Design a protein around this motif. Structure first.
Motif, PDB file in Angstrom:
ATOM      1  N   UNK A   1     -92.585  49.359   9.532  1.00  0.00           N
ATOM      2  CA  UNK A   1     -91.306  48.629   9.710  1.00  0.00           C
ATOM      3  C   UNK A   1     -90.133  49.516   9.349  1.00  0.00           C
ATOM      4  N   UNK A   2     -88.936  49.004   9.578  1.00  0.00           N
ATOM      5  CA  UNK A   2     -87.731  49.791   9.365  1.00  0.00           C
ATOM      6  C   UNK A   2     -87.419  49.986   7.872  1.00  0.00           C
ATOM      7  N   UNK A   3     -87.993  49.167   6.997  1.00  0.00           N
ATOM      8  CA  UNK A   3     -87.779  49.338   5.539  1.00  0.00           C
ATOM      9  C   UNK A   3     -88.876  50.172   4.853  1.00  0.00           C
ATOM     10  N   UNK A   4     -89.788  50.758   5.621  1.00  0.00           N
ATOM     11  CA  UNK A   4     -90.779  51.684   5.074  1.00  0.00           C
ATOM     12  C   UNK A   4     -90.101  52.713   4.159  1.00  0.00           C
ATOM     13  N   UNK A   5     -90.723  53.008   3.040  1.00  0.00           N
ATOM     14  CA  UNK A   5     -90.186  53.990   2.108  1.00  0.00           C
ATOM     15  C   UNK A   5     -91.295  54.566   1.255  1.00  0.00           C
ATOM     16  N   UNK A   6     -91.033  55.703   0.631  1.00  0.00           N
ATOM     17  CA  UNK A   6     -92.011  56.360  -0.215  1.00  0.00           C
ATOM     18  C   UNK A   6     -91.412  56.637  -1.585  1.00  0.00           C
ATOM     19  N   UNK A   7     -92.244  56.469  -2.618  1.00  0.00           N
ATOM     20  CA  UNK A   7     -91.922  56.922  -3.960  1.00  0.00           C
ATOM     21  C   UNK A   7     -92.465  58.315  -4.190  1.00  0.00           C
ATOM     22  N   UNK A   8     -91.567  59.280  -4.396  1.00  0.00           N
ATOM     23  CA  UNK A   8     -91.952  60.677  -4.573  1.00  0.00           C
ATOM     24  C   UNK A   8     -91.900  61.103  -6.014  1.00  0.00           C
ATOM     25  N   UNK A   9     -91.271  60.293  -6.861  1.00  0.00           N
ATOM     26  CA  UNK A   9     -90.985  60.635  -8.253  1.00  0.00           C
ATOM     27  C   UNK A   9     -90.016  61.781  -8.453  1.00  0.00           C
ATOM     28  N   UNK A  10     -89.419  62.274  -7.367  1.00  0.00           N
ATOM     29  CA  UNK A  10     -88.522  63.408  -7.474  1.00  0.00           C
ATOM     30  C   UNK A  10     -87.214  63.027  -8.163  1.00  0.00           C
ATOM     31  N   UNK A  11     -86.807  61.758  -8.036  1.00  0.00           N
ATOM     32  CA  UNK A  11     -85.628  61.240  -8.758  1.00  0.00           C
ATOM     33  C   UNK A  11     -85.877  60.816 -10.215  1.00  0.00           C
ATOM     34  N   UNK A  12     -87.119  60.931 -10.681  1.00  0.00           N
ATOM     35  CA  UNK A  12     -87.439  60.633 -12.071  1.00  0.00           C
ATOM     36  C   UNK A  12     -87.437  61.920 -12.888  1.00  0.00           C
ATOM     37  N   UNK A  13     -87.551  61.790 -14.208  1.00  0.00           N
ATOM     38  CA  UNK A  13     -87.471  62.958 -15.107  1.00  0.00           C
ATOM     39  C   UNK A  13     -88.728  63.121 -15.969  1.00  0.00           C
ATOM     40  N   UNK A  14     -89.114  64.368 -16.204  1.00  0.00           N
ATOM     41  CA  UNK A  14     -90.288  64.680 -17.042  1.00  0.00           C
ATOM     42  C   UNK A  14     -90.240  63.948 -18.388  1.00  0.00           C
ATOM     43  N   UNK A  15     -91.321  63.241 -18.735  1.00  0.00           N
ATOM     44  CA  UNK A  15     -91.422  62.545 -20.017  1.00  0.00           C
ATOM     45  C   UNK A  15     -90.851  61.141 -20.100  1.00  0.00           C
ATOM     46  N   UNK A  16     -90.277  60.677 -18.998  1.00  0.00           N
ATOM     47  CA  UNK A  16     -89.763  59.316 -18.908  1.00  0.00           C
ATOM     48  C   UNK A  16     -90.584  58.466 -17.990  1.00  0.00           C
ATOM     49  N   UNK A  17     -90.487  57.143 -18.150  1.00  0.00           N
ATOM     50  CA  UNK A  17     -91.064  56.212 -17.205  1.00  0.00           C
ATOM     51  C   UNK A  17     -90.307  56.423 -15.907  1.00  0.00           C
ATOM     52  N   UNK A  18     -90.984  56.245 -14.776  1.00  0.00           N
ATOM     53  CA  UNK A  18     -90.324  56.473 -13.519  1.00  0.00           C
ATOM     54  C   UNK A  18     -89.141  55.548 -13.283  1.00  0.00           C
ATOM     55  N   UNK A  19     -88.125  56.110 -12.661  1.00  0.00           N
ATOM     56  CA  UNK A  19     -86.950  55.381 -12.268  1.00  0.00           C
ATOM     57  C   UNK A  19     -87.383  54.296 -11.262  1.00  0.00           C
ATOM     58  N   UNK A  20     -86.894  53.083 -11.421  1.00  0.00           N
ATOM     59  CA  UNK A  20     -87.199  51.973 -10.489  1.00  0.00           C
ATOM     60  C   UNK A  20     -88.616  51.405 -10.559  1.00  0.00           C
ATOM     61  N   UNK A  21     -89.367  51.760 -11.586  1.00  0.00           N
ATOM     62  CA  UNK A  21     -90.663  51.128 -11.863  1.00  0.00           C
ATOM     63  C   UNK A  21     -90.576  50.552 -13.252  1.00  0.00           C
ATOM     64  N   UNK A  22     -91.431  49.593 -13.551  1.00  0.00           N
ATOM     65  CA  UNK A  22     -91.613  49.194 -14.934  1.00  0.00           C
ATOM     66  C   UNK A  22     -93.039  49.504 -15.364  1.00  0.00           C
ATOM     67  N   UNK A  23     -93.308  49.482 -16.653  1.00  0.00           N
ATOM     68  CA  UNK A  23     -94.606  49.805 -17.160  1.00  0.00           C
ATOM     69  C   UNK A  23     -94.990  48.812 -18.247  1.00  0.00           C
ATOM     70  N   UNK A  24     -96.296  48.673 -18.398  1.00  0.00           N
ATOM     71  CA  UNK A  24     -96.917  47.934 -19.505  1.00  0.00           C
ATOM     72  C   UNK A  24     -97.956  48.827 -20.197  1.00  0.00           C
ATOM     73  N   UNK A  25     -97.800  48.984 -21.506  1.00  0.00           N
ATOM     74  CA  UNK A  25     -98.834  49.602 -22.352  1.00  0.00           C
ATOM     75  C   UNK A  25     -99.737  48.487 -22.877  1.00  0.00           C
ATOM     76  N   UNK A  26    -100.602  47.914 -22.048  1.00  0.00           N
ATOM     77  CA  UNK A  26    -101.285  46.696 -22.432  1.00  0.00           C
ATOM     78  C   UNK A  26    -102.301  46.915 -23.547  1.00  0.00           C
ATOM     79  N   UNK A  27    -102.906  48.096 -23.657  1.00  0.00           N
ATOM     80  CA  UNK A  27    -103.842  48.338 -24.766  1.00  0.00           C
ATOM     81  C   UNK A  27    -103.101  48.514 -26.090  1.00  0.00           C
ATOM     82  N   UNK A  28    -101.810  48.887 -26.039  1.00  0.00           N
ATOM     83  CA  UNK A  28    -101.007  48.981 -27.258  1.00  0.00           C
ATOM     84  C   UNK A  28    -101.024  50.268 -28.028  1.00  0.00           C
ATOM     85  N   UNK A  29    -101.476  51.374 -27.450  1.00  0.00           N
ATOM     86  CA  UNK A  29    -101.538  52.653 -28.161  1.00  0.00           C
ATOM     87  C   UNK A  29    -100.270  53.542 -28.046  1.00  0.00           C
ATOM     88  N   UNK A  30     -99.184  53.030 -27.469  1.00  0.00           N
ATOM     89  CA  UNK A  30     -97.942  53.820 -27.391  1.00  0.00           C
ATOM     90  C   UNK A  30     -97.995  54.975 -26.404  1.00  0.00           C
TER      91      UNK A  30
END
Ligand SMILES: [Ca+2]
Ligand SMILES: [Ca+2]
Length: 179
Positions: A1-30
């Motif tokens: 479709x016309x809204x097809x897109x890819x996440x390349x991680x190129x706009x994110x930074x080393x050592x950070x959670x990716x830009x535009x994603x969220x994360x869960x550390x569900x096991x709890x080890x940090x």
């Protein structure tokens, strides 16, 4: 479709959670999903560009992950295609692709695909964010997957879980077919 897109991680930074994603550390080890750059880690090569996202089952020490990486709202997505890489000496970094039709709590997700990566299963060095920079690079091949998304999918999650003391799973070039 016309809204097809890819996440390349190129706009994110080393050592950070990716830009535009969220994360869960569900096991709890940090320890959870982080963007890594090949410009910061000698051992790493991305599938595309310099950046990937990563989750470890060994990183200076053995881990028992249950880490979620959750997309933005992708309502309309019918397919996700992506590439993963593992340390082929310790390959079995089990993961699932999951979908939610509602929210972003772990319980809103259901598994639509999961596998335990294969490799030489052969030993060698393990690699981390603190491992000595002696120039070694893992045996680590990029593998393509294409996963069907059920009607109503709103969020797509990658869940590194059900494994311990292998090494890492990396993801890159995550393409959403919108449719
Ligand atoms: Ca990339
Ligand atoms: Ca964790």
């Amino acid at each position: 479709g016309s809204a097809d897109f890819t996440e390349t991680f190129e706009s994110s930074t080393h050592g950070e959670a990716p830009a535009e994603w969220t994360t869960i550390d569900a096991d709890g080890d940090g320890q959870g999903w982080l963007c890594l750059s090949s410009g910061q880690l000698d051992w790493l090569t991305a599938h595309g560009g310099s950046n990937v996202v990563s989750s470890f089952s060994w990183n200076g020490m053995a881990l028992n992950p249950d880490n979620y990486l959750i997309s933005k709202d992708v309502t309309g997505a019918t397919k996700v295609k992506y590439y993963y890489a593992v340390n082929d000496g310790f390959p079995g970094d089990h993961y699932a692709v999951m979908i939610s039709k509602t929210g972003t709590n772990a319980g809103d997700f259901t598994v639509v695909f999961e596998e335990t990566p294969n490799g030489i299963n052969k030993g060698g060095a393990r690699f981390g964010l603190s491992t000595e920079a002696n120039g070694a690079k893992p045996q680590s091949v990029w593998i393509e997957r294409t996963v069907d998304l059920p009607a109503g999918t709103k969020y797509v999650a990658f869940r590194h879980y059900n494994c311990s003391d292998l090494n890492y799973i990396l993801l890159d070039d995550i393409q959403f077919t919108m449719g």
